[PDB]
Amino acid sequence: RDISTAVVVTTISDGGFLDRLAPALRDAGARLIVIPDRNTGPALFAACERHRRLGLDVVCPSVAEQQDLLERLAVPDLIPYHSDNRRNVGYLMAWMEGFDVIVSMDDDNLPTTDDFVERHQVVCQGPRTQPVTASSDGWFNNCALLEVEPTEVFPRGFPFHARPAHAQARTSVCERPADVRINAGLWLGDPDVDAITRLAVRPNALAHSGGSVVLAEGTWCPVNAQNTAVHRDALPAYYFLRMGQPVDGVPMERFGDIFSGYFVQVCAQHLGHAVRFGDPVVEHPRNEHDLLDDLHKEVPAVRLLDDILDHLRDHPLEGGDYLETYESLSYALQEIAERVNGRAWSPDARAFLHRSAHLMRSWTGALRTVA
Amino acid sequence: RDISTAVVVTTISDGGFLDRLAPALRDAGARLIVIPDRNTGPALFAACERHRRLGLDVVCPSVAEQQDLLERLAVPDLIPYHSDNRRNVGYLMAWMEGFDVIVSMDDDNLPTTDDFVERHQVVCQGPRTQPVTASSDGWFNNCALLEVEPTEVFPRGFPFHARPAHAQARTSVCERPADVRINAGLWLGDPDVDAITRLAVRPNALAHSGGSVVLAEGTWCPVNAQNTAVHRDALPAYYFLRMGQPVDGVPMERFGDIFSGYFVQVCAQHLGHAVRFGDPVVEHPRNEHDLLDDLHKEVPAVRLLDDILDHLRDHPLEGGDYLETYESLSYALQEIAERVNGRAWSPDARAFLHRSAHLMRSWTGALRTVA
Amino acid sequence: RDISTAVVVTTISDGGFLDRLAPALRDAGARLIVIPDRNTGPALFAACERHRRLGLDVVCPSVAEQQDLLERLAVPDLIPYHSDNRRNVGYLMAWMEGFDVIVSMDDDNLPTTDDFVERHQVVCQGPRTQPVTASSDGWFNNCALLEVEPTEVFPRGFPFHARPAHAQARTSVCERPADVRINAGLWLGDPDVDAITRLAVRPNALAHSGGSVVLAEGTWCPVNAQNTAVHRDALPAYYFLRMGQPVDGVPMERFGDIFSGYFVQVCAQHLGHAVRFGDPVVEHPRNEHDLLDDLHKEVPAVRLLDDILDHLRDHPLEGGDYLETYESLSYALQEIAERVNGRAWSPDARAFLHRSAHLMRSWTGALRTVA
Amino acid sequence: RDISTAVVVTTISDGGFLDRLAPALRDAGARLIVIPDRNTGPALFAACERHRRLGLDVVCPSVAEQQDLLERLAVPDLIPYHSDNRRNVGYLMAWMEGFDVIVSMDDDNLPTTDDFVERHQVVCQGPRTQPVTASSDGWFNNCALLEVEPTEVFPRGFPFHARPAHAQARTSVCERPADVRINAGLWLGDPDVDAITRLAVRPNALAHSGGSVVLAEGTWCPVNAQNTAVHRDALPAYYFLRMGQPVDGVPMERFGDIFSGYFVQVCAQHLGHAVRFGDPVVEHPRNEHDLLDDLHKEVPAVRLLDDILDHLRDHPLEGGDYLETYESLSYALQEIAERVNGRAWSPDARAFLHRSAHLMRSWTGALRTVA
Ligand SMILES: C[C@@H]1O[C@H](OP(=O)(O)OP(=O)(O)OC[C@H]2O[C@@H](n3cnc4c(=O)[nH]c(N)nc43)[C@H](O)[C@@H]2O)[C@@H](O)[C@H](O)[C@@H]1O
Ligand SMILES: C[C@@H]1O[C@H](OP(=O)(O)OP(=O)(O)OC[C@H]2O[C@@H](n3cnc4c(=O)[nH]c(N)nc43)[C@H](O)[C@@H]2O)[C@@H](O)[C@H](O)[C@@H]1O
Ligand SMILES: C[C@@H]1O[C@H](OP(=O)(O)OP(=O)(O)OC[C@H]2O[C@@H](n3cnc4c(=O)[nH]c(N)nc43)[C@H](O)[C@@H]2O)[C@@H](O)[C@H](O)[C@@H]1O
Ligand SMILES: C[C@@H]1O[C@H](OP(=O)(O)OP(=O)(O)OC[C@H]2O[C@@H](n3cnc4c(=O)[nH]c(N)nc43)[C@H](O)[C@@H]2O)[C@@H](O)[C@H](O)[C@@H]1O
Ligand SMILES: [Mn+2]
Ligand SMILES: [Mn+2]
Ligand SMILES: [Mn+2]
Ligand SMILES: [Mn+2]
């Protein structure tokens, strides 16, 4: 059977990134779902049509076409505008059309090898006994698989409480049954670190030297949405969380895929599935960012992430598939919002988990409508 | 059958208010459930024991006894301390002990007649054809039943959008079947107005001249918790909402009973029940308050109340009893939080309804545990 | 003896208000300085030219002409756009051109009599023995000069702490030397009350029945900028204060003329000058406003006004003219910002008085440049 | 020639740090001024008396003695409690008593050599031709004088915009006249980096390998208050800035010595004086800190520091001594607060520079009172 792959990219650029992204996608026959926004210029639509007649199966639904679909599914207020949260439209469209693989990318992640789509098809491998990687502290640093200067770094969304003692953790590999459903490809150039790390050492990923790994049950690593393949069964749990909720009056941002990466990861391991890190590797000539503005956006989420990850360890989930498990996860987040203690847990911070949980069940309700 | 009545009062005073509250409660054999807090002095416990040996069936469970009960019901974080929200403990205790009538009062509401408890027993009257009062605009002003100087006023929690045109509304009385389950007694001296009205005209309620009324379906009026009797069947919907959630960064307060008054009211009319206003009347020598501080607390809730009340009109509910209806109301509030539009509906304002809905279902879950 | 009058109005309307404002100004030969903004449509410029051809000495400098003037005076950042603070440009222009009387008005205040300009010329009367009105509590309610329904009201900016006991205050009139330099004309229709009063009673001013008064030293009343004449000597202290400073994170608005009215009033009394209230009376068909939004804007300033007014009584001022006295007042506000105590005096609230003081001295610095 | 040295430390510890701090201070006959706070336990007072009997000239004035002193100098509200800002009391006391050298330290900075006081006496050296260090980019990284693992770091308060291109900057040493008035000793163990750096790489200072340098005019480096000697002439410009002012609603902290270090540095260079970095080196077993809480406190100041430093380059100062120059700097900060542009410059951020400027002049006013 032929594996179908759909690449999802939301962007506000002029479409010039298609010149380097299309070749690997066009040669493999994969579909590219470009999600524009209201603040997206008309040059993107002209760039999609130019690459469409070059052989690329690219679609670029206008904001009017996106809103009509979301209104038919009784979720007109779920996905906001002027935000990269609109990539959920691409997730939904690729899921309705029955694609096997959904590859989430940004407009500044460019494949480096011809087998980019083939490597991401590993999420359709199925269960089989394979070498699995476990860590004594329950955390794995995927940036250790890369050659990074000037010093060692951690990925964005990695819990800070476990960073100092992670160097003494024991990494072991064992032959165990595993079912890879999420494949987080690595990145060269500017690695996916938080604004804290980028402001401190300005890391530069030189090469991919560690190969690929599959994480065992209990070993976690943050998964982003800039070079990540998700099997269609696991896609219901890959909802990009809506940002903007204030923490002590400071609205959070840039962590929509940090939560989605951990949410689909804890849902996968509950269902006997695993997350893979490594190939395919992409180039990340990162778009220009105000690093102090990125820091101001991420800190509200960083202040809560360690506590959320700690409570998720002690909260067992229920469900037979990803829809039931993700909805069970949403109820667990509401229980965590009331038991967690900390100086950063103001009433607006606790209410952030409650509104997020409602939006998660609103996302699953839309998927159950098309199904 | 003898009707059982339990009066619930949470306070941080020294207990001197018992000298005028006990006579009407003691002569009727009603129980008084005083709910202290961590910021409550020991003089209250000595005042309860002094009145207990005078004939009053008064109980004053310590914060250790309250927390033990709430922990046994799997709700240790539901009711916060240093807040008048602890009156929910009195609601829960009176409901577990099987009291027919639950009368919510404050420590500055003093009965004026000997039949205070007997008048509040009207919530056990049952269904019968009685004169019911309807208004063309769907709103009733209970302060019009009082002689107020220097001008006409509206009760606290009355929607502001309907105040200017309420004078032209048509009030009609018709003989219809009604089942009174909530009785909001009126107040003399300082009436229950919002800080806007109290700062503007400083109203003084002189006498109760309008008698008593029972409101028909579609006619609403805010119900407070300072002189209100609730039948035990309707008590599950009388949960005092938790305050402190910020609206555009400003934490709301003083509207815990505004929401509970409207919530139990919309739940009652869905179940074919009605709300009564009038006797018994109490004196309100209001405690000393910083009126500008009261205003700063109420404004965050005032900015949202009109929109919430508008959407509740167009949202039909489900349920066979008050537990099912209140839980259905909690889900309706979450749908309203995403459809409502307005300048005051910041992400923290929308998340206020989501966390409140979770706390409402957490309150119903505790009632289902003892049941 | 040849008195010149310039009227200052800043607006974002289409200029239709000129149809009822021009006749009284055109017959008296007074100049109208209309200050447009960036959010002002082009119809206002066409309305000014249409009325200019009818005989009205009206000027309407574009935002480019305003910014060039403010840049030549080394104050390019003093006056913001998208704000009614731009009336300070009109204050500055009328002062540079040597006008004797500067009448501050809004686009919804319309004269009711033909002698509108002549009555406002009372600020050029000079010192003389005249009936002077004093109050035992130090406050005068100018709304008592009007017939107001449905109840008695207080003007916007009146201290709330002195309202309840003001009815017991003794009002006496004596023949004393006085020099009227500020004349606050009254308003029919919608009186100038705060949002607290307008939301509570919705006042309607029927007629001007109390005549005119001149307040003694030690008797204060807030002076707005919608129908107020200021002598050119007192104009340097009439700087419309810049709004937007947060108080506990809540930005203040609608009180720029409340401070300017009190500031020019305490400066005038220090120099032996007085404030007049009464004629000329204008009609105020108030523009449409979101009253709950007006409340949310005014509360931050209302929380601090009573304390600021109390300290201005204890603080003696220095200076020989309005420029020196206004600067001395600016330093006094900085001393008050550190000695005042209260729950509403967060660090941002105290810093509001410091930035306001610098902007006051920046306004006087620009006036010293043209002089 | 008979040089007096007073060490200033404010602390809430139990006084155990005196065991390792007294020997170097006691052998040199220097005075130790310990400034307790309201949240300081009584064990500190017992530790000071225990070390006083051992020969250490240590004083520990109670909060009542501090407040009496600050009240006599007409500055009772300048220095808040429950804050390390109370070291300004120690700065004031050491200045009133005529000490030549004022060494600012914290309770976790411990001398490593016997000549600790003698090395800090370099601020009494006077003008002479000496090796002076200049940098092409105008910045010097004093952490480059240390052996730091695992990677190169920048000191706390170093501008982030100049960090990437600083490696390409040219460092030259020339024989020029210089007058050292501030000597910033270095620190082993935990270096003085911001929370961004400490969270990212967790630096560890191994040894002092770069020697000592004296910076030229136009070469800046942040100066902290944990191991810094200031000549008594330069002490008036060393006022520890008061924290707590919100930036976009987020109160700043931990940067009181970042401003004081830059302020005393720009004042010294205007007067022909210089700043020295190097010996004496102290050990810094840093007190336990919540690093994410340190980050949440520092970000508000980090968002504004690069812009403030850029404008201080363009702003010329006036004055003959440090008092006149510091006051001239205070007025310069007010001009900068209105001309600076950026996303982080909300009204509360601009007003922070205005209230800080008034507090700077309030500090100089108290110094002019004792003089
Ligand atoms: C931002 C976070 O870090 C990393 O990206 P990081 O290089 O920082 O961020 P960028 O790669 O610059 O931006 C991520 C994507 O968001 C798109 N985008 C930006 N603004 C908008 C907008 O207003 N609307 C829409 N529809 N799209 C928008 C942008 O074109 C790009 O495809 C990644 O791991 C993830 O993007 C993650 O969420
Ligand atoms: C406040 C609102 O307006 C009206 O009251 P309004 O006279 O303003 O307010 P009060 O009658 O002064 O206070 C209401 C009740 O709250 C209690 N209370 C106050 N502070 C605390 C505290 O920290 N803990 C606890 N456990 N109790 C507290 C107080 O003793 C009294 O019984 C009424 O309609 C309702 O109380 C409504 O919620
Ligand atoms: C507003 C306060 O209450 C009372 O007025 P109140 O009827 O509420 O307010 P209005 O009369 O509706 O508005 C006051 C004036 O502000 C102008 N204005 C409104 N928005 C803008 C804007 O963005 N830019 C500029 N340049 N002008 C603006 C408006 O056209 C009118 O001339 C009075 O006492 C005083 O105006 C006082 O300041
Ligand atoms: C804190 C900043 O970073 C670096 O220190 P950093 O190790 O972080 O901070 P610490 O050395 O832990 O604390 C600095 C000093 O503040 C004192 N302190 C802490 N809390 C209080 C309090 O509530 N009141 C008073 N009076 N003192 C207090 C503490 O005992 C110690 O002497 C240095 O460069 C500077 O201290 C700088 O200001
Ligand atoms: Mn990117
Ligand atoms: Mn009360
Ligand atoms: Mn108006
Ligand atoms: Mn330290």
Author numbering:
A (entry chain A), B (entry chain A), C (entry chain B), D (entry chain B): 4 to 374
Give me lines lifted from the publication on this model.
To obtain the Mn2+·GDP-L-Fucp complex structure, we initially soaked the crystal of MtdL containing 0.5 mM MnCl2 with 5 mM GDP-L-Fucp. However, no electron density of the L-Fucp moiety was observed, possibly due to enzymatic catalysis toward GDP-L-Fucp. Then, the S228A mutant with decreased enzymatic activity was used for crystallization. The complex structure of MtdL-S228A·Mn2+·GDP-L-Fucp at 2.2-Å resolution was obtained by soaking the crystal of MtdL-S228A containing 0.5 mM MnCl2 with 5 mM GDP-L-Fucp and 0.5 mM MnCl2. Besides, the L-Fucp C2-OH hydrogen bonds to the side chains of Arg159 and Gln229. Arg159 is located closer than Arg257 to the anomeric carbon with a distance of 3.9 and 4.3 Å, respectively, in the GDP-L-Fucp complex structure. We noted that L-Fucp C4-OH is positioned at a hydrogen bond distance (3.1 Å) with the carboxyl group of Asp260 in the MtdL·Mn2+·GDP-L-Fucp complex structure, whereas the D-Glcp C4-OH is positioned with a distance of 3.8 Å to the carboxyl group of Asp260 in the MtdL·Mn2+·GDP-D-Glcp complex structure. The shorter distance of L-Fucp C4-OH compared with that of D-Glcp C4-OH to the putative catalytic base might dictate the mutase activity of MtdL toward GDP-L-Fucp instead of GDP-D-Glcp.
Members of glycosyltransferase family 75 (GT75) not only reversibly catalyze the autoglycosylation of a conserved arginine residue with specific NDP-sugars but also exhibit NDP-pyranose mutase activity that reversibly converts specific NDP-pyranose to NDP-furanose. MtdL from deep sea–derived Marinactinospora thermotolerans SCSIO 00652 has been discovered in the antibiotic A201A biosynthetic pathway, generating GDP-L-galactofuranose (L-Galf) from GDP-L-galactopyranose (L-Galp). The characteristic DXD motif (Asp109-Asp110-Asp111), together with conserved His287, coordinates a Mn2+ ion, which stabilizes the diphosphate of the nucleotide.
